[PDB]
From a paper:
HPVs are nonenveloped, double-stranded DNA viruses that consist of multiple copies of the major (L1) and minor (L2) capsid proteins. Each of the 72 pentamers is composed of five copies of the L1 protein, which can self-assemble into an empty T = 7 icosahedral shell called a virus-like particle (VLP). HPV L1 VLPs are excellent immune antigens for prophylactic vaccines, as they authentically resemble the native virion in capsid structure and immunological function. Here, we describe two antibodies, A12A3 and 28F10, that specifically bind to and neutralize HPV58 and HPV59, respectively, through two distinct binding stoichiometries.
To understand how HPV type-specific antibodies bind to virions and inhibit HPV infection, we determined the crystal structures of HPV58p alone, as well as those of the HPV58p:A12A3 and HPV59p:28F10 immune complexes to resolutions of 2.0, 3.5, and 3.4 Å, respectively. The structures were solved by molecular replacement and refined to Rwork/Rfree values of 16.8%/19.8%, 20.2%/24.9%, and 23.0%/26.1%, respectively. HPV L1 VLPs form by the assembly of 72 L1 pentamers, and these pentamers retain most of the type-specific neutralizing epitopes found on L1 VLPs and could induce a lower anti-HPV neutralization titer than VLPs.
Residue numbers in the entry:
A (entry chain E): 20 to 403, 438 to 473
B (entry chain B): 20 to 175, 183 to 403, 437 to 473
C (entry chain D): 20 to 176, 179 to 403, 438 to 473
D (entry chain A): 20 to 176, 182 to 403, 437 to 473
Amino acid sequence: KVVSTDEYVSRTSIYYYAGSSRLLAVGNPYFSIKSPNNNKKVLVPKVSGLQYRVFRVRLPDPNKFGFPDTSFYNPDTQRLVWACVGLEIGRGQPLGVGVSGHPYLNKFDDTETSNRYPAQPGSDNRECLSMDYKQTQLCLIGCKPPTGEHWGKGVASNNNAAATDCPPLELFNSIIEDGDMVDTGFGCMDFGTLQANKSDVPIDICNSTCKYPDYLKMASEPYGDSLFFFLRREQMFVRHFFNRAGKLGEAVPDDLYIKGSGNTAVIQSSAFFPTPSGSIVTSESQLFNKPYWLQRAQGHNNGICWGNQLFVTVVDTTRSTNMTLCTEVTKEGTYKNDNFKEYVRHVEEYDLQFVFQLCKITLTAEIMTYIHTMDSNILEDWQFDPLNKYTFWEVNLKEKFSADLDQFPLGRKFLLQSGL
Amino acid sequence: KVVSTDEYVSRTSIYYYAGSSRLLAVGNPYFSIKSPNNNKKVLVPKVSGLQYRVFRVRLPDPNKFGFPDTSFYNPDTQRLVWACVGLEIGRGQPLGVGVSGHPYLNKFDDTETSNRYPAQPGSDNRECLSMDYKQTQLCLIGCKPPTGEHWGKGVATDCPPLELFNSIIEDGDMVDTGFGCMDFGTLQANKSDVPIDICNSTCKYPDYLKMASEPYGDSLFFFLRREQMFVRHFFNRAGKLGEAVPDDLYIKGSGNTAVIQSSAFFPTPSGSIVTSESQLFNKPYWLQRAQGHNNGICWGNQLFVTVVDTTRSTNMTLCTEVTKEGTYKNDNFKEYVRHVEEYDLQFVFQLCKITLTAEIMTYIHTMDSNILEDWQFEDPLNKYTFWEVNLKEKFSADLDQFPLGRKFLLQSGL
Amino acid sequence: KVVSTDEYVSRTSIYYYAGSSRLLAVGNPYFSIKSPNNNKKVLVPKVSGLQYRVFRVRLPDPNKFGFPDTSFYNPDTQRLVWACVGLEIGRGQPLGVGVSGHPYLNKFDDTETSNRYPAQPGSDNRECLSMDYKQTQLCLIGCKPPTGEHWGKGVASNAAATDCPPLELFNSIIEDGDMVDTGFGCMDFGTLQANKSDVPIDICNSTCKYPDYLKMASEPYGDSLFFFLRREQMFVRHFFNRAGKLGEAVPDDLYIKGSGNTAVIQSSAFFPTPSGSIVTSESQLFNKPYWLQRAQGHNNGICWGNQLFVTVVDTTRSTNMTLCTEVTKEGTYKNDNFKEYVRHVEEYDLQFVFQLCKITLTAEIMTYIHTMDSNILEDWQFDPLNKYTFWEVNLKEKFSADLDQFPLGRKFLLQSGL
Amino acid sequence: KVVSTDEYVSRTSIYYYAGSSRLLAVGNPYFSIKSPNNNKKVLVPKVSGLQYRVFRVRLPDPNKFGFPDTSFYNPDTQRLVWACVGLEIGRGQPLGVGVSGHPYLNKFDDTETSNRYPAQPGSDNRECLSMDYKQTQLCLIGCKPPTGEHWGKGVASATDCPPLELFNSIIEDGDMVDTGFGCMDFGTLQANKSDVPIDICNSTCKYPDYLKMASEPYGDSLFFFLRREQMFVRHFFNRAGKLGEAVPDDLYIKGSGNTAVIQSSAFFPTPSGSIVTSESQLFNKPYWLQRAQGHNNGICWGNQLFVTVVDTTRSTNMTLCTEVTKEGTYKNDNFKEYVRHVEEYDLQFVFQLCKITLTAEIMTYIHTMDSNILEDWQFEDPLNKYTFWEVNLKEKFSADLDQFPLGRKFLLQSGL
Ligand SMILES: [Mg+2]
Ligand SMILES: [Mg+2]
Ligand SMILES: [Mg+2]
Ligand SMILES: [Mg+2]
Ligand SMILES: [Mg+2]
Ligand SMILES: [Mg+2]
Ligand SMILES: [Mg+2]
Ligand SMILES: [Mg+2]
Ligand SMILES: [Mg+2]
Ligand SMILES: [Mg+2]
Ligand SMILES: [Mg+2]
Ligand SMILES: [Mg+2]
Ligand SMILES: [Mg+2]
Ligand SMILES: [Mg+2]
Ligand SMILES: [Mg+2]
Ligand SMILES: [Mg+2]
Ligand SMILES: [Mg+2]
Ligand SMILES: [Mg+2]
Ligand SMILES: [Mg+2]
Ligand SMILES: [Mg+2]
Ligand SMILES: [Mg+2]
Ligand SMILES: [Mg+2]
Ligand SMILES: [Mg+2]
Ligand SMILES: [Mg+2]
């Protein structure tokens, strides 16, 4: 049924470079700040190293592009499309690690070395704690937005009496949007719905959904439009061991321990949870600021940018430093806490660089039938929308294409790579 | 006496792809929840990153498969069998690490830096502690279920006699965690010396030496393994010391130091860091030349894929609000723990034919009398627990339509 | 339209070696000691392993240089320029790690494991703490000084919800003595942290700069980066929070309010301390030759204006030495009888191999060079950098044609087969 | 003078496989439990991951072996000997790390961050502490038992410090490897029995004398060896007891008042071997003994072979607990705690048959090298006083190499 694009897409010797120039995002890493009463107007966006960046790269329609000489194809019988053959994800700002926390984290005891009986809980024993998250680098490239997976609240059958009030778990797929949170060491789950107390994870995810890329689904899709290519590097270890306050929903069964007495009469909560740590960041392990040459994709789509668009998805927690800002409210000769206000800001700097190869397609009755079943919108647009409900970082390159490759960094690299 | 399958199994140019699609397991990482109607029925299974996953992969009988053209062999004199030539173990979910513990762990003192005399008094000094286990990745492939080794109570100091037991590793068996491959249920009577997810369980380690040395090599067509741990903390045990330190190894104390402290030490392990670069999975294995004599031949039209992967052992915190109120109160919330595992098994099989001469029939009959009987020329494994993966209806000849199929075609130049 | 220097710069077989000999800097790692009342009289300079070292390397003008035989070009139509083809940044002193701190660091609570309610009272809870910074090695070489990036206060200008300072990304020339980022970011701490206590004293009144690699790599002519190497690393050693008012409160949808003991919310103004971790010989970028054969940009090592800029950060020798003087000698130890000092030193040895080049100044090439930099033709007869601070390295009298008499020269001859 | 065995040992195309099958040791990692009846009889042996395992592998005498066809040599002028050309040290049990300790360790103060004045020990300040030792993997192969080095007390001969002497000895099965406290006779050099954990405090820890074994003329001790050691300092303590050598006065300014009584500078660290990983394993893989660095290229003179192993990467000690009295609530006195350690080995060999023509020149050469070779050939045993793990392969030699794991690996690797 499905065939490689190499069998019906003809490559030309025409190459073009396109660069986004510097892209900047500046905001609060823990939450967005709204303007009242407009609870829907964002004054300060949420900008965090733990966010997916999903760039929707717009390319100029090659069939309406002003080429100096169009004698390389026949518009009566052929249509043009761009193919991505080179990519470099520029990253500015120094390497660094940010931290996240909760002024009311649901941590009760430290359970690593000393947690003797008896335990005297109360009604509110939450603590103001912070941590450094799991480290993640990844880059996804395709002509279709990426698919994520996360656990959310499912539906339980009301037939039989519930042996547990644990919420039912369902694995959801969804498009990863720009700004979505990556998993941080506590799983890819909807914390807003599955953690009702709002205190079991830090505030930058406690009311969010953390998504993980569904690599298995995207790799098995027939046409392979999601993953032309990808890199990923994750790492974490357990930094600390705590337990939760609150009622233990599922009691330890009686065959797993001998009951205590006296000091040990009242069993402590075995609702354990670890804190993650991403450990060290290093230049040597960087995935970015280096060229990717998309020569042969594992899927059937070998870098063909159908619809004259492209999707670059990035996670990079190796520059997650959060800057401390401090203003002086009242100037005095001696230090007073109440004379200053503390703020936290995070920034992200990208510079997307591309090398595109012009391709032509001879529209025979057989190829037209193939492309129609693959995606009818391809032929319609060639003259031979539903993604607007999602949020992407728009990168318009319609006016950025240049045939002079050697005038740009990645272009020079491609010419040396290809022998041109 | 034993010969390579290459000498009597003839290979064809017929290849088939088969995949299980997404396989999900969801449950409680520490213990199963039983039905209120029948305490022997499991309602929420025990699902842990420290379990063996033993998939029993069922293949369609090629001698009864609906091939469009059968002119490539003669059923009057030959029989067919699949050979596994490629495998990829897909693993979903993010990398991560879970923890396990015990509300009444038998830890007495911390013996790392400061543990002066006299020793604390007590009849129950257990503590509520947790830890992160030794890290293990492994994959085993064969047409016979894997054999594990573990220590149990043997046959008869009052120390229990130790016996090394071999057994089939079943789906859901626990891997060793840093405290050894032993039957903790029978060898630790107090139920408090290891966390609750293994204190009433048996931890098994693969008996690689036994499996590699078997004549026909049905157990290990191929395997990979990566273990790691270090000692995170140093504790000692409460309870009477069964074997006192001999008098020639110390000068006796006196007064405050007269009552010797327990030298029943035990460490807590740690698996350290998990990293993408160390992953054994999500990559193709090409089973070209097995070290044993069975070069990937799936006798009985079945295949066993055994996996341990603790690098995705995250345990999710879930919390329900029993009573909604404007200020926080612990009694208004219930805390739960759940763990998930996501697999996607992908295979490439090669059709093979065997000419059943008097010499080959004799050889095979001695190897496994069931083979010829099932060929027309009660299953002893049904008492064991595996995760059956039924690929009877999943075989396809269009390799290039699937990820592993495309990798195989490039690898082999086809 | 920019073209490679290979297309209009002709290479000769003339090579010269030049070395700076030993370069030493000695001072206080945390601050300069100025004259009691005089501002521009520095008694002890600030010298730290966290400083950029930016060497402005002066070369002899080849058009005025006394070659033993000048019969290799035509002054009527050609001019000469040096090309850098070999470099080794010599580093003395042992590998080591220094620490920096603040006697009044704005650390309130340790938020790693135990930080229960209620919050401690007080108007000044600052503490005397130190830390070891993010580790950085880097070397940049070009004929133009490097460009840095850092965050500073932007236009005042979005005020009803927050009074946070406006942020703007500023580009500037990195000067000798500028501070590299340390784990708290590349920002102007002097203006953006008004309490002067949120970072150690060696950066709290300074601007930390990070090289703007992206800008320097995309400049049309490529004069900034003939070649560069970089190696950064850090992890989070500790977790603290800040004292002072929280400027942007946590939205109410991210938590359930406390009560009684937990009624007054603690500060979520968290901040980590960095650690550069281990330094090792095998990770060194220095004390090894770099052969500048083919640059990534269009300037393939051409030292226009007869100068060269070598920029270095090297925190792997950041040991700060303890010095103690005895004011009064007595038979028993008394703290008041001694004075404690801290000193840091840096030892460099810059080594170069240069290749003489000639340019035939045709009408086409003259037009190209004039558009590139009009000073080139004017200086040939065919300074806006003085407002900046650099470590001046004068090699005008250091050029030698006897390459095999010097370490890097022998390495060059062996490398090229000459 | 000394020449390679390649010059006078003729190689045949006859190969044989032999394996020990599973070898198991089970015991107490800290001490043996002696005769519950009488006499030096061990009921529970000392079995530790920090012990040397020295296997004395006995081969069948090829000059008396039942070869199906003996026309390949002439016993009137030739004798046969085995040469080792392949080995694999099988290791069972999971990777892991054990700990060792002392209920009365001579640790006084923690000297890492806070150790203020004044500080004087009482009469008994010992503590119940444990630690994880330096990590060591090593394997040595030869036809002669390995030589170890260790420090002991020298001759009696401004200080009362015991004289030190470097001793050489044969490493015996069960000997302790160095653990991070050095290769010394702790039994004689630490008279208080509390300065190191109980599993070495009355033992001698030996280190292989690589330099002595590599320089021996004939090279019988080390056909081949691998080693991997590692440790860091986990904690810093000092000792109680009188400091034998006071710090000289020129190295400090005296204290006064509460600092007038100087604290002991008898420091000592605790080691840690750090992480164990599969990727660092030396075992469970074949060694092809193709070209030895010494002159003996794998010739098993006397029809025996010595395989020495240290492997602390499976040093897990198992906890066992018996219930003396069953009750509905937990009580410490109702249970007894035990510690057990196990070791699992599977030694696999490929041997190549060799013949030696006994010319006048070779007989003289072999007689000077070792006269017993010719005597046993007919052309007591001083090693019986030592303790080795005996591995009898006399009945285990097989010519069907492809029926066994290492045989198949050897055939595939050699192109046979
Ligand atoms: Mg296109
Ligand atoms: Mg959801
Ligand atoms: Mg939500
Ligand atoms: Mg599992
Ligand atoms: Mg993955
Ligand atoms: Mg107890
Ligand atoms: Mg058992
Ligand atoms: Mg066994
Ligand atoms: Mg064997
Ligand atoms: Mg078989
Ligand atoms: Mg991994
Ligand atoms: Mg996970
Ligand atoms: Mg897992
Ligand atoms: Mg040096
Ligand atoms: Mg406090
Ligand atoms: Mg910029
Ligand atoms: Mg270094
Ligand atoms: Mg050098
Ligand atoms: Mg330095
Ligand atoms: Mg003095
Ligand atoms: Mg070695
Ligand atoms: Mg091994
Ligand atoms: Mg092996
Ligand atoms: Mg061991």
